[PDB]
Design a protein around this motif. Structure first.
Motif, PDB file in Angstrom:
ATOM      1  N   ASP A   1     -17.583  -4.426 -13.984  1.00  0.00           N
ATOM      2  CA  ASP A   1     -18.128  -3.675 -13.533  1.00  0.00           C
ATOM      3  C   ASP A   1     -17.628  -2.350 -12.880  1.00  0.00           C
ATOM      4  OD1 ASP A   1     -18.455  -5.344 -11.851  1.00  0.00           O
ATOM      5  OD2 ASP A   1     -20.413  -5.059 -11.277  1.00  0.00           O
TER       6      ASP A   1
ATOM      7  N   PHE B   1     -29.447   5.510 -22.400  1.00  0.00           N
ATOM      8  CA  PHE B   1     -29.657   5.261 -20.864  1.00  0.00           C
ATOM      9  C   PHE B   1     -28.571   6.412 -20.252  1.00  0.00           C
ATOM     10  CE2 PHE B   1     -29.423   1.045 -21.815  1.00  0.00           C
ATOM     11  CZ  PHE B   1     -30.807   0.369 -21.257  1.00  0.00           C
TER      12      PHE B   1
ATOM     13  N   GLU C   1     -21.918   2.213 -19.161  1.00  0.00           N
ATOM     14  CA  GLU C   1     -21.832   2.429 -20.558  1.00  0.00           C
ATOM     15  C   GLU C   1     -20.306   2.503 -20.781  1.00  0.00           C
ATOM     16  OE1 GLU C   1     -22.420   7.385 -22.670  1.00  0.00           O
ATOM     17  OE2 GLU C   1     -24.641   5.833 -22.163  1.00  0.00           O
TER      18      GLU C   1
ATOM     19  N   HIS D   1     -29.787  -3.258 -16.983  1.00  0.00           N
ATOM     20  CA  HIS D   1     -28.421  -2.499 -17.493  1.00  0.00           C
ATOM     21  C   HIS D   1     -27.736  -2.359 -16.292  1.00  0.00           C
ATOM     22  CE1 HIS D   1     -26.387   0.723 -19.571  1.00  0.00           C
ATOM     23  NE2 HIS D   1     -27.116   1.719 -18.459  1.00  0.00           N
ATOM     24  N   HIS D   2     -26.051  -1.897 -16.620  1.00  0.00           N
ATOM     25  CA  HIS D   2     -24.880  -1.747 -15.516  1.00  0.00           C
ATOM     26  C   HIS D   2     -23.871  -0.661 -15.934  1.00  0.00           C
ATOM     27  CE1 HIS D   2     -25.082  -5.555 -12.922  1.00  0.00           C
ATOM     28  NE2 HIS D   2     -26.058  -5.661 -13.415  1.00  0.00           N
TER      29      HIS D   2
HETATM   30  O1  LIG Z   1     -22.360   3.731 -16.678  1.00  0.00           O
HETATM   31  C1  LIG Z   1     -22.537   4.516 -15.466  1.00  0.00           C
HETATM   32  C2  LIG Z   1     -22.306   4.203 -14.280  1.00  0.00           C
HETATM   33  C3  LIG Z   1     -20.963   3.369 -14.223  1.00  0.00           C
HETATM   34  C4  LIG Z   1     -19.828   4.048 -15.094  1.00  0.00           C
HETATM   35  C5  LIG Z   1     -17.991   2.718 -14.752  1.00  0.00           C
HETATM   36  C6  LIG Z   1     -18.697   1.374 -14.616  1.00  0.00           C
HETATM   37  C7  LIG Z   1     -20.739   1.337 -14.113  1.00  0.00           C
HETATM   38 CL1  LIG Z   1     -20.379  -0.304 -13.262  1.00  0.00          CL
HETATM   39  C8  LIG Z   1     -21.236   1.914 -13.784  1.00  0.00           C
HETATM   40  N1  LIG Z   1     -24.241   4.960 -15.888  1.00  0.00           N
HETATM   41  N2  LIG Z   1     -24.651   5.808 -17.401  1.00  0.00           N
HETATM   42  C9  LIG Z   1     -24.086   6.375 -17.716  1.00  0.00           C
HETATM   43  N3  LIG Z   1     -24.235   7.046 -18.949  1.00  0.00           N
HETATM   44  N4  LIG Z   1     -25.092   5.793 -18.752  1.00  0.00           N
HETATM   45  C10 LIG Z   1     -25.250   4.743 -18.246  1.00  0.00           C
HETATM   46  O2  LIG Z   1     -25.325   4.065 -17.863  1.00  0.00           O
END
Ligand SMILES: O=C(Cc1cccc(Cl)c1)Nn1cn[nH]c1=O
Ligand SMILES: O=C(Cc1cccc(Cl)c1)Nn1cn[nH]c1=O
Lengths: 304, 304
Positions: free
Chosen positions: A187, A140, A166, A163-164
């Motif tokens: 989150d 992802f 990483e 999916h939320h």
């Molecule tokens: O992780 C995030 C954004 C995020 C960062 C921190 C928290 C939340 Cl809820 C979302 N996007 N992301 C980056 N690489 N893979 C993937 O899914």
């Protein structure tokens, strides 16, 4: 014959993917009937993600701020609400491509297919397991948020994952379709501990049965074991303790091969204690735990 | 981040699968426009398969003997013809779900997704490589014949494989969509030699680049090598000889990581000569060769 890490056909899910934009943020949404489901963090900017007050951030948004696009066409948003970590956007059009579906919360150790998406467009599909620690080891990138996990039983799609995020460790976290995270995750862009993970014992045993069916049998031995003895080894090697419920689910595979479950446990014990000695099982040089006993039966019987 | 053996979304292909029955034999067909393509052995009985005279067996068949069913509905067959090892059944209705498509003959070492089907119904999707010896290591049971392999470039499906048979060794053989077998295989139940297979060097190097991008870098070392020196090692270990054309295709990955292709070759040389010492790379305990350099770029950039 042959045994592959097979995903469900993704067509029924591709027909539900949409793009959701709120301000500067774009991610994927799942359009089923007249509702579009997406991660609530679509309402956050980069600054917000360190400690978002989702309730206050959502109050600054109106239906017209959520841009929902189903490839070519724009959906009209007539309602919005937050349920746990998901937003539900009521649209004025039911998705004509809505398949028969259910929302399910899967158990750790269960498997599912993921349709990775960017900007509402499907990029690929892969099969994975929900780790015992409630993380998934996916693929992802930024913008994949809102991509979903599912299983299919004939014509019914059971959605089990959205999916939320990483984690800083590179593993993935997400929710069921009611927006409840699997595991302790929140989150928020904060370092978050994923529990100690373990190997899914019942799945490794299912995969050893798939290996015997498909011709790989070098690992079979003259030994047997007991649940207690096997579990002492499972403990040392960070494998999930095997229970009678797991033995019972392995029943059909034990019946088909004629290899008693405790005898397969003794093969697994010797492989844990001695390694593969530079050999492979079903093209793998490690003990594979992403196939459930149901997956092995389905794949070995050709269910459609 | 994260790197998975990802298949293309199969929706566009699911819409083309049909069931083809001739006498007592049922297999899958691919309906594109007003033509249904399927393996010519749909006209054989078990006795025929030992040495079929396809021309004579097809002469006993008329359009009405080919039963083509697209799930619920029956297609009317108005023509039939054999082209190499495929039958082309002209139907009176163009498939409303025909995507933009091409028929391509892939090269050994290239990858593709397979939509495994039984009785015209999709069961699962997986990614695989055409081995250098023109076999595939799939997951195909009886009745999977006619299932197809493909790649997708935005909205265009390039069909590259149709499954025909399982060799007595358990590996799979099939044709392009013009019915030409990949490799020396013939559609006859006879023991058939698959050539000596080799590991797809350019793909293993692409996968090592995917590993560095995605955080796994323990295998990087202080060494470099030359194409000649590396190829002496490739020879000993049954790897395909690396050429400047392969180095050139690895260019983008070398540029993105800053690791010169010959330096990655020296890491691969040390891994071939010393093994993994009980470690893993992208969750694998062996050197993975089913990702092309294009696959790695696509997956690492999030192409839809
Ligand atoms: O992780 C995030 C954004 C995020 C960062 C921190 C928290 C939340 Cl809820 C979302 N996007 N992301 C980056 N690489 N893979 C993937 O899914
Ligand atoms: O191999 C055949 C039938 C066949 C046998 C011999 C030749 C030909 Cl052309 C076809 N089916 N099969 C069995 N397991 N997997 C799979 O694809």
């Amino acid at each position: 014959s042959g045994f592959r890490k097979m995903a469900f056909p993704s067509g029924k899910v591709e027909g539900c993917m949409v793009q959701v934009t709120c301000g500067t943020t774009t991610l994927n949404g799942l359009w089923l009937d007249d509702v579009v489901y997406c991660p609530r963090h679509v309402i956050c900017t980069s600054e917000d993600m360190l400690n978002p007050n989702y309730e206050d951030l959502l109050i600054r948004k109106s239906n017209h701020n959520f841009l929902v696009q189903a490839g070519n066409v724009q959906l009209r948003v007539i309602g919005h609400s937050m349920q746990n970590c998901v937003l539900k956007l009521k649209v004025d059009t039911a998705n004509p491509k809505t398949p028969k579906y259910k929302f399910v919360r899967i158990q750790p150790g269960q498997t599912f297919s993921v349709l990775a998406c960017y900007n509402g467009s499907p990029s690929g599909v892969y099969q994975c397991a929900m780790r015992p620690n409630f993380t998934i080891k996916g693929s992802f990138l930024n913008g994949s948020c809102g991509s979903v996990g599912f299983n299919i039983d004939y014509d019914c799609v059971s959605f089990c994952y959205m999916h939320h995020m990483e984690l800083p460790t590179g593993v993935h976290a997400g929710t069921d379709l009611e927006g409840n995270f699997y595991g302790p995750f929140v989150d928020r862009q904060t370092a978050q501990a994923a529990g100690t993970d373990t190997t899914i014992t019942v799945n490794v045993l299912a995969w050893l049965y798939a290996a015997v069916i498909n011709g790989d049998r070098w690992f079979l031995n003259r030994f047997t074991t007991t649940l207690n003895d096997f579990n002492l080894v499972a403990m040392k090697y960070n494998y999930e303790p095997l229970t009678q419920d797991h033995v019972d689910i392995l029943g059909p595979l034990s019946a088909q091969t004629g290899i008693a479950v405790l005898d397969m446990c003794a093969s697994l014990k010797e492989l844990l204690q001695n390694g593969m000695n530079g050999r492979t099982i079903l093209g793998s040089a490690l003990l594979e735990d992403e196939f459930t006993p149901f997956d092995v039966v389905r794949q070995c019987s050709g269910v459609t």
